[PDB]
């Protein structure tokens, strides 16, 4: 049922980047893992949803 009514979608999990400032607790403006957002992401997983 789910595979039938769903749409193909890329699922990528979220995790806090190591680049977070240890003292303020807020992220670097630019880094490869996360582009200013304080949360990085894992490789995508193909999924129907």
């Amino acid at each position: 049922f789910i595979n039938d009514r769903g749409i193909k979608v890329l699922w990528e999990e979220a995790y806090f980047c190591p680049c977070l400032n240890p003292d303020t607790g807020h992220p670097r403006v630019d880094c490869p893992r996360c582009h200013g957002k304080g949360i990085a992401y894992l490789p995508p997983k193909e999924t129907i949803m």
Binding site: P32, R33, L42, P43
Partner: protein
């Protein structure tokens, strides 16, 4: 000849090198190049990196898990990361659609079979079905 490429043929050799732990470089189509690696320690699993440059005090590679498909390895070209050459400065890449003229002044299409050069830097090209060498000007890059 030129030493800028040494592709691996058998997937068995690829797996053997992965067991040894040496990094690999895996090309893609209209997409960024990939590095692949086997994780160390107790648990063995494949890891990948989107970065390509050599490790240094100012540059470190990032590794993450991924369910790499054997289809990619068997199909796509693979090299040893340490011994890979970034570019060979030639107009036409290897395995590229090209056009030429035969000995009887007949036009024909082909793909590049070999890329060669002399000691003075002049580049000669050999096409499929043509044993003789062709000048860079004599070839024509066919549009997709």
């Amino acid at each position: 000849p030129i030493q800028d490429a040494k592709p691996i043929d058998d997937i068995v050799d690829i797996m053997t090198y992965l067991k040894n732990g040496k990094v690999l470089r895996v090309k893609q189509d209209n997409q960024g190049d990939i590095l692949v690696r086997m994780s160390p320690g107790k648990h063995k699993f494949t890891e990948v990196s989107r970065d390509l440059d050599k490790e240094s005090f100012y540059y470190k590679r990032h590794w993450v898990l991924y369910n790499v498909s054997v289809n990619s390895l068997i199909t796509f070209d693979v090299y040893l990361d340490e011994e890979y050459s970034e570019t060979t400065k030639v107009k036409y890449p290897k395995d590229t659609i090209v056009e030429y003229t035969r000995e009887d002044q007949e036009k024909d299409v082909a793909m590049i079979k070999e890329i060669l050069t002399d000691n003075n830097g002049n580049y000669f090209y050999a096409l499929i079905g043509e044993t003789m060498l062709f000048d860079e000007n004599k070839l024509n890059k066919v549009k997709d």
